[PDB]
Design a protein around this ligand. Structure first.
Ligand SMILES: Cc1cc(Nc2nc(N)nn2C(=O)NC(C)C)ccc1Cl
Length: 344
């Protein structure tokens, strides 16, 4: 059941949320995507994640971030409510599908896709939200070339609970190929700078239409980053949590960084200038999303008056709480109610 307000067309694929249904609002004919989260309250970690995503997507109001158009209200008694139905914007493709296809992808495509990504990020980052899992598949693109950041399951603030495993096991946070050196190496510096490494990776991937660091495992991933970036500094090496990784990096002959001009021959000069400001071992050495929008490479689209920040910041306190499956269900049901009490 989809509240009798919608008409289901077909089951489509989604880069950010796996499998969704293309549908239409029966009154207006407006095309939408309907995500079903089956048995949503069965497992603690899944239930916590649904709550996190709902709170994050409700807090944001930005064209480059995926929006909740509607959330279906429980039709059955409370005890029987097991599946959540979320109405999202209908996004036909994603950046993974576009990069890795026979479709055009000129420097102008790259410039415009990076612009939309950084626009959405400047806003997200000012709310003290770190996506922590940016990748081409998570950057939804529609028929009108609108890029929208989706999939906030890995998202956290500047402060995290020690009660969760990823607080210590940072190398398991997100996707290997786009995972920031501070997460790979447990450098105890976890800011929005994490996302700018991932942006750099996506930027490189758009320029060559191939993954920049497609490591086969943990060590191989580090070897790939070090083949381009060179050996990390002694300060980065001293900050490495694990003794085996630290010893492994120290066991290697020194390597100087490879110029980006050698990595991407004949690629646009301003594109490579910006890329080098993102791909740095040191998180604090990286350009912020706001300063990147000021870079000459994005001058074409850059309008400071059309690139908002997000006020107030987003608070992750709800997520640090040890909540039972029932308490999470209660908090999700209260999000549905709030979403509806804020419209009417
Ligand atoms: C759009 C939206 C999506 C979710 N998705 C969600 N929650 C949980 N637990 N899994 N999940 C997935 O999308 N999983 C797939 C990747 C297989 C939750 C809330 C909202 Cl608003």
């Amino acid at each position: 059941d989809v509240g009798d307000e919608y008409e289901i067309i077909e089951t489509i694929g989604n880069g950010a949320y796996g499998v969704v249904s293309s549908a239409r609002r029966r009154l207006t004919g407006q095309q939408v995507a309907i995500k079903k989260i089956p048995n949503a309250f069965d497992v603690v970690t899944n239930a916590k994640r649904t709550l996190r995503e709902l709170k994050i997507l409700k807090h944001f109001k930005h064209d480059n971030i995926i929006a909740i158009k509607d959330i279906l209200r429980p039709t059955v008694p409370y005890g029987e409510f097991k599946s959540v139905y979320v109405v999202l914007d209908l996004m036909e493709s994603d950046l993974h599908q576009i990069i890795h296809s026979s479709q055009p992808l000129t420097l102008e495509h790259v410039r415009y896709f990076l612009y939309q990504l950084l626009r959405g990020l400047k806003y997200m980052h000012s709310a003290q939200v770190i996506h922590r899992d940016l990748k081409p598949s998570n950057l939804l693109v529609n028929e009108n070339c609108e890029l929208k950041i989706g999939d906030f399951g890995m998202a956290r603030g500047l402060c995290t609970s020690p009660a969760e495993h990823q607080y210590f096991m940072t190398e398991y946070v997100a996707t290997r190929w786009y995972r920031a050196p501070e997460l790979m190496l447990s450098l105890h510096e976890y800011t929005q700078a994490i996302d700018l490494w991932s942006v750099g990776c996506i930027f490189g991937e758009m320029l060559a239409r191939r993954q920049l660091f497609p490591g086969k495992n943990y060590v191989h991933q580090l070897q790939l980053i070090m083949m381009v970036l060179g050996t990390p500094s002694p300060a980065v090496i001293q900050a490495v949590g694990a003794e085996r990784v630290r010893a492994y990096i120290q066991s290697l002959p020194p390597r100087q960084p490879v110029p980006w001009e050698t990595v991407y021959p004949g690629a646009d000069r301003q594109a490579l200038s910006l890329l080098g400001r993102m791909l740095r071992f040191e998180p604090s050495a990286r350009i912020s999303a706001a300063a990147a929008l000021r870079h000459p490479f994005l001058a074409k689209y850059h309008d400071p008056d059309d690139e908002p920040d997000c006020a107030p910041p987003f608070d992750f306190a709800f997520d640090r709480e040890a909540l039972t499956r029932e308490r999470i269900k209660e908090a999700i049901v209260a999000e549905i109610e709030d979403f509806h009490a804020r419209r009417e």
